Structures are given as structure tokens and as C-alpha cells.
Design an enzyme around this catalytic site. Structure first.
Site, short mmCIF file in Angstrom:
data_model
loop_
_atom_site.label_atom_id
_atom_site.label_comp_id
_atom_site.label_asym_id
_atom_site.label_seq_id
_atom_site.Cartn_x
_atom_site.Cartn_y
_atom_site.Cartn_z
N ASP A 348 28.24 -12.01 24.71
CA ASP A 348 27.09 -11.80 23.88
C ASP A 348 26.73 -13.26 23.41
O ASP A 348 27.54 -14.17 23.49
CB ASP A 348 27.48 -10.83 22.75
CG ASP A 348 26.59 -11.01 21.54
OD1 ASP A 348 25.43 -10.50 21.61
OD2 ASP A 348 27.12 -11.64 20.60
N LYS A 459 1.49 -14.51 6.70
CA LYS A 459 2.76 -15.18 6.37
C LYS A 459 2.62 -16.67 6.03
O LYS A 459 3.45 -17.48 6.44
CB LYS A 459 3.76 -15.00 7.53
CG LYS A 459 5.23 -15.04 7.11
CD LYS A 459 6.15 -15.24 8.31
CE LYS A 459 7.55 -15.63 7.86
NZ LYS A 459 7.52 -16.80 6.95
N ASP A 689 30.73 -10.62 19.04
CA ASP A 689 30.97 -10.83 17.61
C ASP A 689 30.73 -9.54 16.81
O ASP A 689 31.64 -9.03 16.17
CB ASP A 689 30.09 -11.97 17.08
CG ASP A 689 28.60 -11.64 17.12
OD1 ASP A 689 28.18 -10.96 18.07
OD2 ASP A 689 27.87 -12.06 16.18
N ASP A 693 28.84 -4.93 20.08
CA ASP A 693 29.75 -5.24 21.16
C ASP A 693 30.96 -4.31 21.15
O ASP A 693 31.78 -4.35 22.07
CB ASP A 693 30.18 -6.70 21.07
CG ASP A 693 29.01 -7.66 21.03
OD1 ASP A 693 28.01 -7.40 21.74
OD2 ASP A 693 29.07 -8.67 20.29
MG MG Z 1 26.35 -11.14 18.82
#
Ligand code: MG
Ligand code: OBN
Ligand code: CLR
Ligand code: CLR
Ligand code: MG
Ligand code: MG
EC number: 7.2.2.13
Lengths: 995, 281, 32
Positions: A348, A459, A689, A693
Site C-alpha cells: 500500500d 475555498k 498500514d 489493508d
Molecule cells: Mg495506507
């Protein structure tokens, strides 16, 4: 439950798109006043508190049993049971095995028990050090009930009650946002989105995950404030479903354990082949069915490598010890090797491949782009700050922000130190703090009057302060915002400290610069300022945000500031080493494509020179659908397309593209990609992380999580963890795993070489009817007695060549224990060992008066207790205990001789290919293996009372040297074998022998 | 199992592999036979290299039992046929007609006499002569024709024999001997033997002992020693000593230990046949 | 007499060796 886990593998849905009218008409809530206290207290006890059900796995210490079975400890178990059974059959008469077979079964049992004890103690130690790492700080939610804001425990929050979140606060449960002010939530862990996404009452995207009207559990709110009604609580939330799915998947069999199974099938195969063929053979001569069965059991059990469990477990444990020394912790003992067999790594991006910290990269001055220092330790190159344009820009970026260094950051490095503010605002703050000096006295230098926080629409964020300079007491105004809108609201341009109008030449130079930096993957923020006509707007003029006091158009545009989150330091090198190992690297991320591909190119997942389909279509100015995808070596797959994909399409994508990046992918889709990689029949390692995942890291052949920056769920679902968050360890892993494999073979080979000289004495004993050359005690003093230390020392062997140069092993083709290996150990070396042993045997007996040719058929009268006149070749008469003593003295010298040939076997097993003159004796544990081995044998023989105890008797000097020429023969033979193998890698000796 | 083209498992190259193993195992065999051959070259044709293992010679019986027990019916012929046939095949070598040749046999003293030393261990002198042993030396047990003949039929009789050890020269106990129990006075020239019910402890003892030796002497004559081996003295006749129990309790089992005494004699507590003897009857 | 072998000297030699080689191997393991 199958239906349950079938519903958990499916992506979610929601009510998120509704009128607030229908929202509170459905939920039965007041928008402003929330719900009543009594109603909240009613819903809280109705189902359950807000929290995830604690992880379903809490195995009792009865889990000890898990380590006592496996696949190998089972083989030793049935070995023991066969031993005890054989003793049971041997209760048919008065029988010796009280000192033989019962002890054999009890020993096997002891080995299994102790091995299980040790492995379980290691795994439990890992469990403990994992328990210590659990720090859970209660964060109380701010709810609103009966019109009053009450901050209560997070677990007391219910469905459909108004909750307010502020900057830094963590989202209590799954909310539907009714109102928002400048609210940026951090979704990085859950959905994988790197940059904080704005949250608004409005419905944006049909997919509830990417939409702005929903805030999610376990996400921290970066900045601003928000109000929302709770849609989901507890296990019913999104990450709760992710966690219950991740907890409800299966680990899958490790390649190492499978190889062990194959190996066992081989050993038992030859065990029962020998056992049966010899049972038939023994029945063919004389012996009754009783004795025949006894022989069958004796052989099949003898073929069992008792000490190999101990040695292997110790080996795995050792490598695991080193892994722990590198702060790479593996939850499971046999998951250490798996990396080495991995042909594909799915990683990832954010939190894993990257530092996950937004940082200023490139800047725009005088129609020129200058790269800042993006490294964590500031080891790069600093730009030129002499320019006044940089001064102006830096002052603008520093003066308008919500970013504030928190109270306790003083000594810490300006980069890694904490900041209260937005992503962009944090990066800007740090950059200005390092480069242009302190932003404290510089921010308080100019006094802020009235500011406009970044609007829900357009914005644009502006603020306006007084002047701190000497010459011009004009009112200063500064604004930052999206490049296009600020381009719309600006006219004048600043260059080298003097202004200008905008000409379409440099205006489009600015445009193409913006598209260049935006296409580079970085997010670009436009910066402008306008000094004010203090004549029209005096020093006493107080202006508010009600109307427009200042000329919002015809401002002075200064420059651009672009930012991105950098990869971790050891990451690019790691990816390079992984690609050098023959491992295919595929980034799998739920991030935006523009950033995903850029990071992929940065870390080397997509190499320089390779083009995606869209790149080819971009350079040739033709439709994207025109070009041939075969011409595209690299590919970036949008997550939008993956939902419509079939298995054949994913297979084709994975096959026909070397460099692959999956972008905007949901967790379930990550699972599908992993499974798709496994469909190819290839071992998979995954690194991540956040919780997205969790399904992947679980399903993967091996998962790898991050100790600190990783979430809890994916940490639980991982089979391995990196405590120091060093990505490079992965390389070490695939290094380690690739080495430990080779050594294992050697180790195994060694012990399996011992079985031939162990088994054959009892074999021909039955055949030639000779007195028994080798007793049971001696054999136990070999497998578990001596060979242990050398077999363990064989694990400290290093690489014979570069292991990271070679392609990953083929699970079908390349085997741990294979036909070649058995062809070697049993076939060749072990036979020479047996010859040496029988030689020593005949030496001793012939020197004591019994000649070999006379020794045939003697055992009948020899094992007879009550024949005390037994004629040797010389005509002398031997009592029972005398000749039995001789036989027992033959046992000890046979044992010693086994040690002697195990010298040469140890040295030659030290190297599978290289000659010993090359790899060297540099392994010390091996040397001590030899010394300790010899000293132990000599002790056993010559220790006082060992003829009473183990019935091992001292050896006459000459006995020792009888096994020497056979050992030498072994060394020379395997040396010239490992010569010819080197010289002729066709090769016949290579195909037949090399293992 | 089989497909094209392989025999299970892979059968193309089988010729190469099997040839390799034929040559290989052939070389290994040849090597082993070589080492064993040199080993056999180092072994003597006259004396064994290590005699230390048999050093305390043992005492053996003519009717060697399953385990140390003569149990038979004094009536039933088929009861003692085993024992009887064993003694027959044992003493079949000792017949007066069995030793005819004055060439290979020597007529020695009718009375125990000094040890006979013939040359050395070597083949310098030819094949050595062997002293004669008449079955008449054992009276009332297997003497020629007249009586027993049932071989203990009325009352139990067993001959004890000393184990053979090359070069062994038995040393009888000194005339200063400590409590050797009733024994005769000829002690210099013979190795003595005495039997009791239980050895050092309380006895069930019921017995009456009659010994038949050389010249009616309870022990082995030294004139039959040393034994020069199977090669130098084939058809060698070792001394025998008959022991009859006349008075015994018939239907009750008692045990008997026979001990041989001398300086060259020693006993093992672990080996019950080493230096001593045990039989249940 | 040939029937006396000295097992005690041989024994002593064996054990003494054992100690020597063992402590030597201990010296080998520890490389400082
Ligand atoms: Mg990640
Ligand atoms: C002549 C024959 O041998 C006697 O016994 C024989 C059978 C059996 O008793 C045993 C002891 O049980 C066998 C046992 O079977 C299997 C072993 C444990 C086996 C091993 C597995 C392993 O890992 O290491 C070695 C190989 C041989 C073994 O070591 C012993 C060796 C001593 C022996 O005693 C020999 C009896 O006298 C019998 O009655 C007679 O028929
Ligand atoms: C060419 C080299 C390496 C060795 C040649 C092989 C032969 C000739 C050697 C190797 C091992 C040797 C033996 C080792 C054991 C001793 C025991 C001793 O009681 C008598 C001699 C004897 C039996 C040796 C005789 C010669 C021997 C059989
Ligand atoms: C360590 C490796 C390289 C092997 C080389 C050393 C060999 C040749 C040594 C080490 C162990 C030694 C033995 C130690 C035990 C003694 C007992 C003694 O009564 C006779 C000699 C004898 C039997 C030794 C013979 C030589 C021996 C076999
Ligand atoms: Mg797993
Ligand atoms: Mg073994």
C-alpha cells in the site's frame, strides 16, 4: 456464518444521501437539540455500547496443544505409539525392551513435548511483547442532548444523536454530517486517501466512502468543526465490519509447513516400503509372525528421524532470533522463511511506502520552479532565498494559516515535531520555519484584523494585517487558494520585487507550470497578495467580513507552492533490491491516481522509461483507446474499472504488465487483487498500514504491518510486524528466508545420512544372523546425543553465492527435500558410513577371537542367555555376560565410528555446491560442533560406570582409527563431486546429485 | 506411473543411474573387502590378540537346560530323554574307541600330575599331542556299560566342565587355604570344586554329595593344561568332573551352586556362570 | 599374564582428552 462472511466481503452501502428532513424523520431525531437523555440511555442498553466486540480470538493456554501436534510432531507421535504398541506385543514373553523400546517411545514423546514447549514459549513471548505495545487512551465524545452539549464516554454514544467534532478530535462513530465549518477529516488509515478530505453537509459522491457528507470511526479530524447525526455504532460501523471480516478469514498453509508435509510423506514412504518388503522377506525364511511383526515395527520406527524435529525447530527459532534482533517481529514461528519464497509484493502507498507527512516540494518564483529540501534530515539542496519574491511569498504563506506549533515542541527537529493545523498549513509552517527563520515573531509582526477561513465554495482563504515596514504604512492583504480561482481573481504579477500586468505568454507559462507540477503528483496552492490604498482605507478604518472592503480582483499574484508526502528513506533502495531479487512489485492503493503513479515512479515501482497506455496516448496526440496495450509495459488501474472486472481481465492485467499500480481501490478490492495474484499460483507478501489493508494482510501468504504508523486491526491480521517502521527489513526478510532454506536442506541431509548406518545393523542382524552391531542406546546417543550440535551449527552457514541475484524458488519444481537429496544421503554417503561402522565392528570382534566368517548364524546361540560355552574361531568358550560385554564394546565403537564419519559428513554438508576450500571453515559453531562432539563421544565411552549404566564400555586406542579411511573417502568423494558439479553445470552429476 | 516417455517416476535415464549405482556400490564393496582383508592380515593364526575378556573362566554343565533347571520324572522314560541324549552326544567324543591313535593322543597319568608345557605358541614343533581321558574316571555316572545307566535315574548326577581358554594355566589355592570346607590334600596339582545349596545365606539345604574326579579326586588335573588351541590341538579333550546327589527331597525344588577355587579363578556377581555354577533341581 | 589389560590408563587418557577438546572448543566459540 458462511452467509455472514459472504455479506462481509461485499462493499458497503448507506442512507447517506437524504434530505436532513427525511434523515431525522427516519432516525427520529432533532437536528439542533439532538435527542433526549432518556432516549440515548434507552438506545445504549438496547443493543450494545459503542466499541468493537473485543477480538474473538483469546485462546486459553490450552492452546499449548496447538504446538504439540502440527504435521511433524504427529509423525513422532505415531512413531511413539508404534513403539508402545511394539512393546505391548513384546509383552507376549519375558522381554528386554524395558531398556529398549519403551524407552524409545517415551523418548519420542519427550521430544515432541519439549519441542512444543519451546516453540510455544517463543510464540507466547512474542504474544507478550505484543500485549505490552497496546496503548488505548479513552477519548470521550462530545454529544448534544436536549439542546445541551455533554461530553460523555465514547462507548456511551448511540445511534442518531447529534455529535460535534473539533480540530484534533477523533470521530466517535459513523456520522452523517448535518453541518460543517472548515472541516478537514483525516481518512488516511481507513480509505487510504493521503490528503485530508473536506467534509460537507452536501452529497457529493454516490459511493459513501468518497462522499463528503459522512465522517468515519477511528478517523482523526484534522481541522475545523462539524455536526452530525450518528448512522452507525460499535461493530456495525465500517472499520468494525472490516475488523470482523479480517478476524474471520484464514491464515492459509505456509510453504515451509507444506514442504515439511511432502518430506514426511517421503520418509514414511521409504519407511513402510522397507518395513513391508522386509516383513515379507523375513517371513520367507524362518521367523514366526510374532518376530516378523516385531521386525516390521522395528524398521518402520527406526526410519524415523527422532532429533530432526528438535534441530529444525531450533533452526527456525534461531533465524527468528535474528529477525527479532533487527526489530522485525514475526507473530508465527514458521512465517519467517516465507519472504524468501515470495515472487510478488503488494504494497500500500500511504503509511507504508511513504512517511505520510505532507511536505513542501517545489515552488514558483519569477516564472521559475525551485525544488526545496524534501528529506527528513535536510540532507538535500537549499534553493536561493536572496530573491525578494521569495521573501514576499514566504511572508504570505506564513502569515495566513491556522497552523500553530503546539506548546511542548521546542527541542524537537522542525520537521518531525508536531503541529496543530491542516496538512498544507503544517507543511507550509514547517518550511517557513526552517528556511526563512522563525514564524513566531514574524506572524505577530503583522497584526491580523479580519480573516476569511477557507470557504465551502471556491475555498479561498484570505487575511489582512497592518504594515511592519518603515517606508510604506499601507494595509497588507494576503490570500491563498486553488490556482484556477485565484487566477480568475488576479491581474497583477510580481517579479524580482517589482510588479507588472499579466500577459498571456507568462500567464500560460504559469498555467503549464501548474499543470506540470500538478501532473507531477503534487498538490498546488496559489498564493497572492495585495497592498491596499491606505488613502481610501485609512489607518483607523475598521473593516469586517460582511461586505467587500478590499479589491478582491486586480490583486498581485506572487507564485505557486506545491506539496506531497515523501517516501521513507529506506524505501526506494528496498524496492530496488526487491526488483533485483526477481520479485514483482505491485502498488495497491485507494489513493488518487495522480499521486499514486507519481509516488510509484518515485520509489521505483514504475521505472524510468516505461510508459502507461495514457502516456503513449498523451505523447502521440491520439485517443487513449487507439494505442495497443501490449506496447504499454506499465499500467495504472483506476478503481472505478476494477468493480466491473472479471477474473480473466485481472489475470490478463497481472500477466501482461510488469509494473502495476492499482489506484482508488477499496479494501475488498485489495483482497481481490491479492487473491488474483494467488490464482497465478505465486507466493504473495503484502505490506500496509491502515485498516484497509486488514483483509489483504490477512489473506496474503505473508502479511507485514507497521509497528507505529499502522492501525490495530491490520496489526492483528498481519503474520509479521515491523517495529521500527524500516521498509528495508523486507529485503532482509527475503534475504533471510532465502538463506535459511538452503541451510535447512543441509541440516536435514545431515541427520538423514545418519539413518543408514543406524538402521542397517539391525537389518543384516536379521539377515546374516550376526550378533547385533549397534544397540538402541547408541542410536539415541547419535540422533539426540551428538549430531545435535553440528546440525544446529549447520544453520550458521552463510550464503554460498549471491542469493538476491537468483530468481525466487518455484514451489512446484524446487523442493526442500527432494529425490536428489535422498539419492545422496541414503544412497551414497550413508552407505559409506555403514561400511565404516561394520568395518570397526569386524575389527573389534576379530581382534577378540571371533572371525567375521565364523560370526554367521551365531546370534541364535549368542543371544541365548543360558549357553555359557560358545566357541569362537580359536576354540575358546564364552559365557553369556562375557560375549555380551564384547558386543556392548562393539556398540560403543560403532557409535564412535558413526561420529567419525559424521565429521566428514558435517564438513561436506556445510556446502551444497562450493568446495570446502572456498566457503572456508569460518563457521565457528561448526568447529565447536566437532570438538564437543568428539569430546562427548569419548566421554560416553570412557566415563566411569557407563558400562553399568548405558552399557557403553571404554575403547582400546586402535578402535578409534578404524573409521578414518571411510570418512576420508566421504570427504574426497563429495569434494570431487562438488568439483565436477562446478566444472560441468550441464549436468549429469548436477541433475542426479545436487540438492 | 507411465507416460511418453517415462517409467515411474522418470524412466528415460534409468540405465545411467542404475549403472552408476552398480559401479558405485561395487567400488564400496571392494573397498570394504580390502579394509577387512588387511584387518584379517593383522590377525594371528596361533593366539588371539586379546584374551582379557574370558580371563575368569566359567563352569558349565553337561545337560545345558532352558534355564538352569533339571526337572524330570524318575519313572517316565520320555521325561529324561532330553538330558540323557544330551549327555550321550556330550561324552560321545570321550570313548576309548574314540581315541585310537597313539599319534595324536597321549596316555598321561592315572593320577593328577604337573602341567604339561609343549614348546611355544608357534608352529616350529608340529601338531601337539593330547592327554587321554578315560570315562572310567567318573564312576557310577556313565562309566562304560555297567550302570547307571539312566543317567541320574535313581538319584541326580551332573558333570561339571571348565571353560577352555588358550594358554590358561590354572593356579590351585595354596595349602594355607582359608576354610575351603572338606577337601582332599592333593591340592598342589589340581583345581578344586565344591557345591552347596545356597551360597552365603540361610539354606533350604538337603543333600548328599558324591564326587568323581581323576583318580577319585574332586577337581581338574593340571596335566591337561595349558590348552594350545583349536589349530595346534584339534580333537582336544578337556577334563570333566562328575557330581552326584544321592539324598535329595524329591518333589521340592532346591537350588545348587558349585564353585571352583584357585588363584587363577575369579567370580562375577553379574555373570553367574563365571567362575561359578548354578542349577535348580 | 595376557589376561590383564590396563583399562584405567586408557580411560584416563580418554577423559583428559575430553576435557581438553571441550575447553578448546569453548575457546573457539568465544572469539572476543
Ligand atoms: Mg495506507
Ligand atoms: C533375536 C531376536 O532379538 C531380540 O530382540 C530383537 C527385537 C527387539 O527385542 C529389539 C528391542 O525391542 C529391537 C526393537 O524391536 C527395535 C529397535 C528399538 C529399533 C530402533 C528404532 C530406532 O529408532 O532405533 C533403533 C531397531 C532395533 C532396536 O534397537 C531393538 C534392538 C534390540 C532388540 O531386542 C532385538 C529378542 O531376543 C527376540 O526375541 C529375538 O527374536
Ligand atoms: C589409501 C589410504 C587413504 C588408506 C588405504 C586403505 C588400507 C590399506 C588401510 C585403511 C585403514 C587401515 C586399517 C585401520 C585399522 C587398523 C586396525 C589394526 O588393528 C590393524 C590394521 C588396521 C586394520 C589398518 C590396515 C590398513 C587399512 C585397512
Ligand atoms: C578433531 C579432528 C580433526 C580429529 C583428529 C583427532 C583424533 C585423530 C584424535 C582426537 C580424539 C582422540 C582420542 C581421545 C581418546 C584416546 C584414548 C586413549 O586411551 C587412546 C587414544 C585416544 C583414542 C585418542 C586417539 C586420537 C583421537 C581419535
Ligand atoms: Mg496470515
Ligand atoms: Mg536417526
Amino acid at each position: 456464518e458462511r452467509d455472514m462472511d459472504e455479506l462481509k466481503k461485499e462493499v458497503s452501502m448507506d442512507d447517506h444521501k437524504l434530505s436532513l428532513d427525511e434523515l431525522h424523520r427516519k432516525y427520529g431525531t432533532d437536528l439542533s437539540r439532538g435527542l433526549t437523555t432518556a432516549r440515548a440511555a434507552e438506545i445504549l442498553a438496547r443493543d450494545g455500547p459503542n466499541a468493537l466486540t473485543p477480538p474473538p480470538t483469546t485462546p486459553e493456554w490450552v492452546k499449548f496443544c496447538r504446538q504439540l501436534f502440527g504435521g511433524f510432531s504427529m509423525l513422532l507421535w505415531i512413531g511413539a505409539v508404534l513403539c508402545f504398541l511394539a512393546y505391548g506385543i513384546q509383552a507376549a514373553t519375558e522381554e528386554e525392551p524395558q531398556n529398549d523400546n519403551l524407552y524409545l517411545g517415551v523418548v519420542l514423546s519427550a521430544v515432541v513435548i519439549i519441542t512444543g514447549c519451546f516453540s510455544y514459549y517463543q510464540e507466547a513471548k512474542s504474544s507478550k511483547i505484543m500485549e505490552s505495545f497496546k496503548n488505548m487512551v479513552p477519548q470521550q465524545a462530545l454529544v448534544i442532548r436536549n439542546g445541551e452539549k455533554m461530553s460523555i464516554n465514547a462507548e456511551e454514544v448511540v445511534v442518531g444523536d447529534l455529535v460535534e467534532v473539533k480540530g484534533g478530535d477523533r470521530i466517535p462513530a459513523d456520522l452523517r454530517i448535518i453541518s460543517a465549518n472548515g472541516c478537514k477529516v483525516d481518512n488516511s488509515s481507513l480509505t487510504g486517501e493521503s490528503e485530508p478530505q473536506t467534509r460537507s453537509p452536501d452529497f457529493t459522491n454516490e459511493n459513501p466512502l468518497e462522499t463528503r457528507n459522512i465522517a468515519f470511526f477511528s478517523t482523526n479530524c484534522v481541522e475545523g468543526t462539524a455536526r452530525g447525526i450518528v448512522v452507525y455504532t460499535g461493530d456495525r460501523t465500517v472499520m468494525g465490519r472490516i475488523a470482523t471480516l479480517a478476524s474471520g478469514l484464514e491464515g492459509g498453509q505456509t510453504p515451509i509447513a507444506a514442504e515439511i508435509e511432502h518430506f514426511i510423506h517421503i520418509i514414511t514412504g521409504v519407511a513402510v516400503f522397507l518395513g513391508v518388503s522386509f516383513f515379507i522377506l523375513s517371513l520367507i525364511l524362518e521367523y514366526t509372525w510374532l518376530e516378523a511383526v516385531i521386525f516390521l515395527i522395528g524398521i518402520i520406527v527406526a526410519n524415523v528421524p527422532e532429533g530432526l524435529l528438535a534441530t529444525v525447530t531450533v533452526c527456525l527459532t534461531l533465524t527468528a532470533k535474528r529477525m527479532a534482533r533487527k526489530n522485525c517481529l514475526v507473530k508465527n514461528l514458521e512465517a519467517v522463511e516465507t519472504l524468501g519464497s515470495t515472487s510478488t509484493i503488494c504494497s500500500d502507498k500511504t503509511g507504508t511506502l511513504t512517511q505520510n507527512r505532507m511536505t513542501v516540494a517545489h515552488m514558483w518564483f519569477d516564472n521559475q520552479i525551485h525544488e526545496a529540501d524534501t528529506t527528513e534530515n535536510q540532507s538535500g539542496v537549499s534553493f536561493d532565498k536572496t530573491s525578494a519574491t521569495w521573501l514576499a511569498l514566504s511572508r504570505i504563506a506564513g502569515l495566513c494559516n491556522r497552523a500553530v506549533f503546539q506548546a511542548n515542541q521546542d527541542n524537537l527537529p522542525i520537521l518531525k515535531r508536531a503541529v496543530a493545523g491542516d496538512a498544507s498549513e503544517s507543511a507550509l509552517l514547517k518550511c517557513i520555519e526552517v528556511c526563512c527563520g522563525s514564524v513566531k515573531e514574524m506572524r505577530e509582526r503583522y497584526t491580523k484584523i479580519v480573516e476569511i477561513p477557507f470557504n465551502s465554495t471556491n475555498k479561498y482563504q484570505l487575511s489582512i494585517h497592518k504594515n511592519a515596514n518603515a517606508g510604506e504604512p499601507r494595509h497588507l492583504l494576503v490570500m491563498k487558494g486553488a490556482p484556477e480561482r485565484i487566477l480568475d481573481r488576479c491581474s497583477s504579477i510580481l517579479i524580482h520585487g517589482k510588479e507588472q500586468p499579466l500577459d498571456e505568454e507568462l500567464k500560460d507559462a504559469f498555467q503549464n507550470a501548474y499543470l506540470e507540477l500538478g501532473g507531477l503528483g503534487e498538490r498546488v496552492l496559489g498564493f497572492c497578495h495585495l497592498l491596499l490604498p491606505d488613502e481610501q482605507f485609512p489607518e483607523g478604518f475598521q473593516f469586517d467580513t460582511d461586505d467587500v472592503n478590499f479589491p478582491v480582483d486586480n490583486l498581485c499574484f506572487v507564485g505557486l507552492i506545491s506539496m506531497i508526502d515523501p517516501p521513507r528513506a529506506a524505501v526506494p533502495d528496498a524496492v530496488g533490491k526487491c526488483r533485483s531479487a526477481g520479485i514483482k512489485v505491485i502498488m495497491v492503493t485507494g489513493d488518487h491516481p495522480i499521486t499514486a503513479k507519481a509516488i510509484a515512479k518515485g520509489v521505483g515501482i514504475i521505472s524510468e522509461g516505461n510508459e502507461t497506455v495514457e502516456d503513449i496516448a498523451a505523447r502521440l496526440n491520439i485517443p487513449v483507446s487507439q494505442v495497443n496495450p501490449r506496447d504499454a509495459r506499465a499500467c495504472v488501474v483506476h478503481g472505478s474499472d476494477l468493480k466491473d472486472m472479471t477474473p480473466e481481465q485481472l489475470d490478463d492485467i497481472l500477466k501482461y504488465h510488469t509494473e502495476i499500480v492499482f489506484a482508488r481501490t477499496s479494501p475488498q478490492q485489495k483482497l481481490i487483487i491479492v487473491e488474483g495474484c494467488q490464482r497465478q499460483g505465486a507466493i504473495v507478501a503484502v505490506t500496509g498500514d491502515g485498516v484497509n489493508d486488514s483483509p489483504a494482510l490477512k489473506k496474503a501468504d505473508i502479511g507485514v504491518a507497521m509497528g507505529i504508523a499502522g492501525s490495530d486491526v491490520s496489526k492483528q491480521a498481519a503474520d509479521m510486524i515491523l517495529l521500527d517502521d524500516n521498509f528495508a527489513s523486507i529485503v532482509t526478510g527475503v534475504e533471510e528466508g532465502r538463506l535459511i532454506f538452503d541451510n535447512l536442506k543441509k541440516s536435514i541431509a545431515y541427520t538423514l545420512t545418519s539413518n543408514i548406518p543406524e538402521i542397517t545393523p539391525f537389518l543384516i542382524f536379521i539377515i546374516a544372523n550376526i550378533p547385533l552391531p549397534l544397540g538402541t542406546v547408541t542410536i539415541l546417543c547419535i540422533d539426540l546425543g551428538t549430531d545435535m550440535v553440528p546440525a544446529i551449527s549447520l544453520a550458521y552457514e552463510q550464503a554460498e553465492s549471491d542469493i538476491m541475484k537468483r530468481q525466487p524458488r518455484n514451489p512446484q519444481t524446487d523442493k526442500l527435500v527432494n529425490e536428489r537429496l535422498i539419492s545422496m544421503a541414503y544412497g551414497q554417503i550413508g552407505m559409506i558410513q555403514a561400511l565404516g561402522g561394520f568395518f570397526t565392528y569386524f575389527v573389534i570382534m576379530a581382534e577378540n577371537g571371533f572371525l567375521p566368517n565364523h560370526l554367521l548364524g551365531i546370534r541364535v546361540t549368542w543371544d541365548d542367555r543360558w549357553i555359557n560355552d560358545v566357541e569362537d574361531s580359536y576354540g575358546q568358550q564364552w559365557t553369556y555376560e562375557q560375549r555380551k560385554i564384547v558386543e556392548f564394546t562393539c556398540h560403543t565403537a560403532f557409535f564412535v565410528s558413526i561420529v567419525v564419519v559424521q565429521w566428514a559428513d558435517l564438513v561436506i554438508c556445510k556446502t551444497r555446491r562450493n568446495s570446502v576450500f572456498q566457503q572456508g571453515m569460518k563457521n565457528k559453531i561448526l568447529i565447536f560442533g566437532l570438538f564437543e562432539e568428539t569430546a562427548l563421544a569419548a566421554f560416553l565411552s570412557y566415563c566411569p560406570g557407563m558400562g553399568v549404566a548405558l552399557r557403553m564400555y571404554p575403547l582400546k586406542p586402535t578402535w578409534w582409527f578404524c573409521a578414518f579411511p571411510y570418512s576420508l573417502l566421504i570427504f574426497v568423494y563429495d569434494e570431487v563431486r562438488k568439483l565436477i558439479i562446478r566444472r560441468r553445470p550441464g549436468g549429469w552429476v548436477e541433475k542426479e546429485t545436487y540438492y | 506411473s507411465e507416460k511418453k516417455e517415462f517409467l515411474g517416476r522418470t524412466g528415460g535415464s534409468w540405465f545411467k543411474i542404475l549403472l552408476f549405482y552398480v559401479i558405485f556400490y561395487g567400488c564400496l564393496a571392494g573397498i570394504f573387502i580390502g579394509t577387512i582383508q588387511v584387518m584379517l592380515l593383522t590377525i594371528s593364526e596361533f593366539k588371539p590378540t586379546y584374551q582379557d575378556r574370558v580371563a575368569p573362566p566359567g563352569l558349565t554343565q553337561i545337560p545345558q537346560i532352558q534355564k538352569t533347571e533339571i526337572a524330570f520324572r524318575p519313572n517316565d522314560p520320555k521325561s529324561y530323554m532330553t538330558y540323557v541324549d544330551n549327555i550321550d552326544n556330550f561324552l560321545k567324543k570321550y570313548r576309548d574307541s574314540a581315541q585310537k591313535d597313539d599319534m595324536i593322543f597321549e596316555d598321561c597319568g592315572n593320577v593328577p600330575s604337573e602341567l604339561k608345557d609343549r614348546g611355544e605358541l608357534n608352529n616350529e614343533q608340529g601338531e601337539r599331542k593330547v592327554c587321554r581321558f578315560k570315562l572310567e574316571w567318573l564312576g557310577n555316572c556313565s562309566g562304560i556299560n555297567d550302570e547307571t545307566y539312566g543317567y541320574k535315574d535313581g538319584k541326580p548326577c551332573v558333570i561339571i566342565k571348565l571353560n577352555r581358554v588358550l594358554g590358561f594355566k590354572p593356579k590351585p589355592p595354596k595349602n594355607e587355604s582359608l576354610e575351603t570346607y572338606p577337601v582332599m590334600k592333593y591340592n598342589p596339582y589340581v583345581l578344586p570344586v565344591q557345591c552347596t545349596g545356597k551360597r552365603d545365606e540361610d539354606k533350604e539345604k538337603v543333600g548328599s554329595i558324591e564326587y568323581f574326579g581323576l583318580g577319585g579326586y574332586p577337581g581338574f588335573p593340571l596335566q591337561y593344561y595349558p590348552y594350545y588351541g583349536k589349530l595346534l590341538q584339534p580333537k582336544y579333550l578337556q577334563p570333566l568332573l562328575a557330581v552326584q546327589f544321592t539324598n535329595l527331597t524329591m518333589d521340592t525344588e532346591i537350588r545348587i551352586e558349585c564353585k571352583a577355587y584357585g588363584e587363577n579363578i575369579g567370580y562375577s556377581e553379574k555373570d553367574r556362570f563365571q567362575g561359578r555354577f548354578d542349577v535348580k533341581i | 599374564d595376557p589376561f590383564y589389560y590396563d583399562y584405567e590408563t586408557v580411560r584416563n587418557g580418554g577423559l583428559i582428552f575430553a576435557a581438553l577438546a571441550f575447553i578448546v572448543g569453548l575457546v573457539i566459540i568465544l572469539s572476543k
